[PDB]
């Protein structure tokens, strides 16, 4: 699209409509973009000394990108609630994007006095990496997505990436991608950039919780017909004499019943409690946390494989890195106290996946014989096994929406671990930069790189609309399901509202599983 200077390049679309089966969440926000790295690509690396587990090598670019991989960039409390309360599941189908009403300003810091003014002509160029030839950054839970609250103006993030490294230094194989080596489209004012995408058949996120659970799944009333090993030894006057007898598992017997499927896999996490007291006093934050390691650098295992966060009656506990944790609007960056964060809870799964903090089961160790007692041992890490079945990490309104499946020789069940939809070809990276403006050059020629540009930034609005599909409920469940509600009682502030000084804020994390489906 194209037009004039006194012509709005696009209108403001920010609705949300439900169609019974679909529902489209349109949404627009105003943004701003500075000139990063003063227009140059800069090489960047870990700090020489820095622990090995923390080295790196890569580049930062003068390019800034766009991102809305956060559910709340599309759903509004209320809306989300609608969804989350009457749908067995849902998934994204297609999207449409558009930047417009772009405007380029140029600040002038003459002595003690700045003065911003329109640089009409100068441009901002955009380009979408629709061929995925660029290090996909999104999906890395970074923060600089869209504001949950419309009215909020925002700054565009700067693109940076990482290649290979042998400590703080580069290794040859590492590649250096240059963003100008693409065909950016250049916008001036009166210019807009639209583009549209279509998702790929993915599974509806399961937005329901299970009423039955693996173990308790058969019918009480009837005993099976298969037998199991009831007792081993037997009374012989005073002493026992080994004599194995078997029984037919019934209701009273349950624990012993024969089955057909196994809980999901696991990778044991340390348990910490919301109650300061209980927790051993010391620094096992890193030392005790569950991790894995590549090329000799141990990394953390955050968002551990999807597994319930606490047994019955222990909402007080949680994994050291088995859950998602968001900050309460305002919460500072580092070492903030428990009271400043919102920890997610995944009890809803208990029913199928193991509890993060407790071992999977316990396999037998030795082979018993008359002169040898029967061994056994608990298992803290069980990789996928036939017959296992499980549930993936719920979603949360202010959580990630999707993530790119890495291009590898092999993947195994790609639901992104941080939760979300695992996409092979996700929404392409959208980039934006401000074509430089060489400030006054010298009369006599010089072949040096230009270094003195006009100080200036850009701004303008952006809009994103997405169509989601739904799987409606359908249970013959007689008694009421659970629903997500807002507290009745009076409060000094409404949830998901602007305070007295107009600061919007999300009180709690809102999950997705409320409706109840049987297993």
């Amino acid at each position, epitope marked *: 699209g194209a037009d004039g200077v006194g012509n709005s390049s696009g209108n403001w679309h920010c609705d949300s409509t439900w169609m019974g089966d679909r529902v489209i969440t349109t949404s627009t926000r105003t943004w701003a973009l500075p000139t990063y*790295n*003063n227009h140059l690509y800069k090489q*960047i*690396s*870990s*700090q*020489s*000394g*820095a622990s090995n587990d923390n080295h790196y090598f890569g580049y930062s670019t003068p390019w800034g990108y766009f991102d809305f991989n956060r559910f709340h960039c599309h759903f509004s409390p209320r809306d989300w609630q609608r969804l989350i309360n009457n749908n067995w599941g849902f998934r994204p189908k297609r999207l449409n994007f558009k930047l417009f009403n772009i405007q380029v300003k140029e600040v002038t*810091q003459n002595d003690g006095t700045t003065t911003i003014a329109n640089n009409l002509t100068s441009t901002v160029q955009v380009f979408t990496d629709s061929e995925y030839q660029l290090p996909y950054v999104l999906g890395s839970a970074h923060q600089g997505c869209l504001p949950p609250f419309p009215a909020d103006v925002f700054m565009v993030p700067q693109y940076g990436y990482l290649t290979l490294n042998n400590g*703080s*230094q580069a290794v040859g194989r590492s590649s250096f991608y240059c963003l100008e080596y693409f065909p950016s489209q250049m916008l001036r004012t009166g210019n807009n950039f639209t583009f549209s995408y279509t998702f790929e058949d993915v599974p509806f996120h399961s937005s329901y919780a299970h009423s039955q659970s693996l173990d308790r799944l058969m019918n009480p009333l009837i005993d099976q017909y298969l037998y199991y090993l009831s007792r081993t030894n037997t009374p012989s006057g005073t002493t026992t004499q080994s004599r194995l007898q078997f029984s037919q598992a019934g209701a009273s017997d349950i624990r012993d019943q024969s089955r057909n499927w196994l809980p999901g896999p696991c990778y044991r996490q340390q348990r910490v409690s919301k109650t300061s007291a209980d927790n051993n006093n010391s620094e096992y934050s890193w030392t005790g946390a569950t991790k894995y390691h590549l090329n000799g650098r141990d990394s953390l295992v955050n968002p551990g494989p999807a597994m319930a966060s606490h047994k019955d009656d222990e909402e007080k506990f949680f994994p050291q890195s088995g859950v998602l944790i968001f900050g309460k609007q305002g919460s500072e960056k580092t070492n903030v106290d428990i009271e400043k964060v919102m920890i997610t809870d995944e009890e809803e799964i208990r029913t199928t996946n193991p509890v993060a903090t407790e071992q999977y089961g316990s396999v037998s160790t030795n082979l018993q014989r008359g002169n040898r007692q029967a061994a056994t041992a608990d298992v803290n890490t069980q990789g996928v096994l036939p017959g296992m079945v499980w549930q993936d990490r719920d979603v949360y309104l202010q959580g990630p929406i999707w993530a790119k499946i890495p291009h590898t020789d092999g993947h195994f069940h790609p639901s992104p671990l941080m939760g979300g939809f695992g996409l092979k070809h996700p929404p392409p990276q959208i980039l934006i930069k401000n074509t430089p403006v060489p400030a006054n050059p010298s009369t006599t020629f010089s072949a040096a790189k230009f*270094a*003195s540009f006009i*100080t200036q930034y850009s701004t303008g609005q952006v809009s994103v609309e997405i169509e989601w599909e739904l799987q409606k409920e359908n249970s013959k469940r007689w008694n009421p399901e659970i629903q997500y509600t807002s507290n009745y009682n009076k409060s000094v502030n409404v949830d998901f509202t602007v305070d007295t000084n107009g600061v919007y804020s999300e009180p709690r994390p809102i999950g997705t599983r409320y409706l109840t489906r049987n297993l």
Partner: antibody
Amino acid sequence: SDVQLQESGPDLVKPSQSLSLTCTVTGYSITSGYTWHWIRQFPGNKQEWMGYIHFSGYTNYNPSLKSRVSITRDTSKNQFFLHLNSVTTEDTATYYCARGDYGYEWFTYWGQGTLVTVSA
Amino acid sequence: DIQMTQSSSSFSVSLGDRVTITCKASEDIHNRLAWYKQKPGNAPRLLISGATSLETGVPSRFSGSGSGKDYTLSITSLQNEDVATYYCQQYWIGPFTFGSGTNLEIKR
């Protein structure tokens, strides 16, 4: 004010001669990390950055000085050296060696400094 | 080369007072600026790097702020150890360049 590292070298040098200084480091290894720099201060006050040598042995020099400066290293000794040729009176100054916490930032540790005067 | 200019050439202050020093760059440094302290007859010492990050062992009284062209170093309550000249240094691009320095005479 405070730091560690020690420079050594002749106090006096004749003009057209070459200046050679050595910086001996203790409490740290020249390899494995950090870039070691040379900086000088003219008697008036200003600081001027001469150049550096990386842990890997790569060097970078100030463009003004580039033609007559050379920085080298002796890992065994844990010392790095500065060689400045075609010295002039302007070269008189206190020379410092310093470590650079590298990657993001700069000079974490500085030497005492050695005064070098260029006179006939 | 990027040129750094430091504000007050000299200040006199006593223990306990708050002092502020300014440094501005010819071009946008992008917070790659460090502050050093130098005592008489002594070599410089690193106070702050990355414009605002305190070096290990540096007291909380020291703080730095700034962005773009202009940066500032502030000492909340001067201490006797504080007497010295302070220099700002840019490491955005080679060659690295230093400011002219500000002499703080603490000591009545």
